[PDB]
Amino acid sequence: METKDLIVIGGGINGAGIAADAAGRGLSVLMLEAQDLACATSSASSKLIHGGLRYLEHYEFRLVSEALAEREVLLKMAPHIAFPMRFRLPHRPHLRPAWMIRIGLFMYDHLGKRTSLPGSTGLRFGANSVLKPEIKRGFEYSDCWVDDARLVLANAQMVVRKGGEVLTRTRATSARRENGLWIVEAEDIDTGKKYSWQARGLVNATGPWVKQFFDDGMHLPSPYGIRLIKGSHIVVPRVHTQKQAYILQNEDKRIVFVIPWMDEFSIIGTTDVEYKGDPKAVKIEESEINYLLNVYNTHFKKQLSRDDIVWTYSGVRPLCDDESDSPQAITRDYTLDIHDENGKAPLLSVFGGKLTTYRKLAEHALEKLTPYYQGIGPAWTKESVLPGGAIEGDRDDYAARLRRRYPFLTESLARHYARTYGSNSELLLGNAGTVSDLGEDFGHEFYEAELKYLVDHEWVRRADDALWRRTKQGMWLNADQQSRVSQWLVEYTQ
């Protein structure tokens, strides 16, 4: 025994969130990830903890109000990686009447009741603004930004903290009920090593693959269809010097964001394109680029071309199929299904689920698995503080406090460590007292001490994990700098 209480198949936001919650209730948990943590949908989002302004249009109050209330919970759980942001909504009366926005903003302000985040206002835009001169009016309100891939990583760490196990580069190949228990089989994608475990409960949190795991892994009927709806984002040198995001109303009624990113760039996204095929192959396409630049170039005076684009990414939303014609009208609320046999071996499956709502998703999932467990602790995550999150304050004021005790750190490296690692920065820096104590410089102040730490404590196995998920250093390192990181990782992980 050898028998885990719970096995979670899935290492994106919904699987890590269920595993964490369960590990902190005393269940012995094993989370399996086929490749890396956040390697799919959860590292491809617009990176927003939002209530979901556009969803009020479709009367989605369960969701918008749940999500609104969650912004402030997440903002206390993970202040290294999440923070407040203001969004400016340019006014276009031919699409939505000023009187309507005004009603929407009120509901946004009061559906979740918020003890910290500011509140909405009107705006006039002059001849000197970033917007084309015909646009003269708007609105401003609040929502939050999170480092998505990192948030998944904070939940993986929380699982290990509470005695859970997290395997990556390990793909579950089947699950079958046998004599009251699950037999789960998995296979290490590199070495071909086989594994086999028994469990009392199973979570299918594989996201875009949820129904495929029923079909191919379990030979069971799925309770819901899934619609894959691709969205892509483009990244450009920052379009302006302001700190606010803009939310733009497009002619098709879908809103597109222009979000400041890393003090240096702007992300523009996203799109809604029905998708068929391997979710691992999703890539942005020509019309998506032309679409995103069009909505941007029709609103802002500084025009962008295709040539300005420095990076793009793309993922598929796994949305619970409510059968709507238009991909943009499909619900973003999640659905959980649970089912047992002879009152044993429950299977919880997750369909849909924003990053915003994951903790509450996870709490609902444990509500449903409780009957199967003892003995089982109560809910507890609303109170906690994710690993890295214990900064006795502000991130700009942990970055100062960090450089005060490690004053060999430049202000840019302190800012990075604080905004990435938070209170884990001391575990990374260990006993270093000079810059040369940090080891090989891999480029852009990404030192061997960081890389070693990522492997030892953040499940890094390949360069992309480190450079695109655990950090966004891949934005600055050249091709030969990146193969060196992979060379070192080969040397170290031997």
Ligand X SMILES: Cc1cc2nc3c(=O)[nH]c(=O)nc-3n(C[C@H](O)[C@H](O)[C@H](O)COP(=O)(O)OP(=O)(O)OC[C@H]3O[C@@H](n4cnc5c(N)ncnc54)[C@H](O)[C@@H]3O)c2cc1C
Prior bond of 331 cis (ω within 30°): no
State in angstroms the smallest separation of the CB of 122 from ligand BOG.
Answer: 8
Q: Are strands 347-351 and 137-146 parallel, antiparallel or unpaired?
A: unpaired
- Binding residue (CB under 6 A) for ligand X from 8, 18, 44, 418: 44
- Binding residue (CB under 6 A) for ligand X from 231, 260, 346, 389: 231
Residues 176-205 that bind ligand X (CB under 6 A): 205
| Percent of residues in the chain assigned helix, strand, coil, to nearest 5 | 35, 25, 40
C-alpha–C-alpha distance, residues 445 and 103, integer Å: 48
Q: Does 45 bind ligand X (CB under 6 A)?
A: yes
Q: Does 29 bind ligand X (CB under 6 A)?
A: no
Residue with Cβ nearer ligand X (414 or 454): 454
Do 136 and 93 contact (CB within 8 A), yes or no?
Answer: no
Q: Does 112 bind ligand X (CB under 6 A)?
A: no
Residue with Cβ nearer ligand BOG (113 or 193): 113
C-alpha–C-alpha distance, residues 348 and 277, integer Å: 25
- Binding residue (CB under 6 A) for ligand X from 5, 21, 33, 66: 33
| Interior/surface letters 192-211, b for 16+ CB within 10 angstroms, e for the rest | eeeeebbbbbbbbbbbbbbb
Q: Does 138 bind ligand X (CB under 6 A)?
A: no
Residue with Cβ nearer ligand X (142 or 423): 142
Structure letter (DSSP) for residue 57: G
Q: Does 330 bind ligand X (CB under 6 A)?
A: no
Which residue has tokens 């990522």?
454
Residue with Cβ nearer ligand BOG (22 or 111): 111
33 binds, among ligand X, ligand BOG, none (CB under 5 to 8 A by kind): ligand X
Q: Which of these segments, 80-88, 296-304, 353-361, 368-376, binds ligand X (CB under 6 A)? A: 353-361
Of 235, 68, 64, the closest CA to residue 144 belongs to 68
Measured at CB, which residue is nearest to ligand X? 12
Tokens of 8: 């979670």
C-alpha–C-alpha distance, residues 330 and 271, integer Å: 13
State in angstroms the smallest separation of the CB of 375 from ligand X.
Answer: 27
Which residue has tokens 């009927």?
221
- Binding residue (CB under 6 A) for ligand X from 6, 40, 111, 268: 40
**Binding site annotation covers 234?**
no
Contact partners, residue 302, CB within 8 Å, separation at least 6:
130, 239, 240
Q: What amino acid occupies position 202?
A: L
Contacts with ligand X by CB under 6 A lie at 9-15, 32-35, 39-42, 44-48, 171-172, 205-209, 213, 231, 270, 315, 317, 353-356
Task: Mark the binding-site residues, compressed into ranges.
Answer: 5-33
